[PDB]
């Protein structure tokens, strides 16, 4: 038990940013949230990371998270929240095709969304 968190689950699409035919940034859940401010509280995988690590960061092919055993995983850092996407890599990567412009579109399908938010 690393920290204390509250129970949040949903089932919906997600928004991201494609850069060189692969999504290297998260944007939002069921919508695309505008980035036109000096905010830096996000992971910002655009500079110093890739799509190849974006997957391991907050996506899984099997939700095994209980928000009490993540002391054993890479997420032991006691963050304020995280947003786990239970999907395959295909419906995430293939949202874009030929895009170099650092942009994507919101998905259309409904995936298992697994948030967990801190409770002090």
Curated annotation (Swiss-Prot):
SMART domains: RNAse_Pc. Belongs to the pancreatic ribonuclease family. It holds the Pfam family RnaseA. PROSITE patterns: RNASE_PANCREATIC. InterPro entries: RNaseA, RNaseA-like_dom_sf, RNaseA_AS, RNaseA_domain. The lineage of its organism: Eukaryota, Metazoa, Chordata, Craniata, Vertebrata. One of its GO terms (biological process) is defense response to Gram-positive bacterium. It is an enzyme of class 3 (hydrolase). Substrate binds at residues 79-83. GO terms for molecular function: endonuclease activity; nucleic acid binding; RNA nuclease activity. The keyword Repeat does not apply. This is Protein P-30. It comes from the Eukaryota. Its EC number is 3.1.27.-. Basic protein with antiproliferative/cytotoxic activity against several tumor cell lines in vitro, as well as antitumor in vivo. It exhibits a ribonuclease-like activity against high molecular weight ribosomal RNA. Disulfide bonds join 15-32, 78-3, 96-18. Keywords: Disulfide bond, Endonuclease, Hydrolase, Nuclease, Pyrrolidone carboxylic acid. The active site is at 25 (proton donor), 58 (proton acceptor). It comes from Lithobates pipiens.
């Amino acid at each position: 038990r690393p920290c204390k968190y509250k129970l949040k689950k949903s089932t919906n699409k997600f928004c991201v940013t494609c850069e060189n035919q692969a999504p290297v940034h998260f944007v939002g859940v069921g919508s695309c949230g505008s980035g036109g401010s000096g905010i830096f509280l996000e992971t910002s995988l655009s500079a110093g990371s890739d799509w190849l690590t974006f997957q391991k960061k907050h996506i899984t092919n099997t939700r095994d998270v209980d928000c009490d055993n993540i002391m054993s995983t890479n997420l032991f850092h006691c963050k304020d929240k995280n947003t786990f996407i239970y999907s395959r890599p295909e419906p995430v990567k293939a949202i874009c095709k030929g895009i170099i412009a650092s942009k994507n579109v919101l998905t259309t399908s409904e995936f298992y969304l697994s948030d967990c938010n801190v409770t002090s």
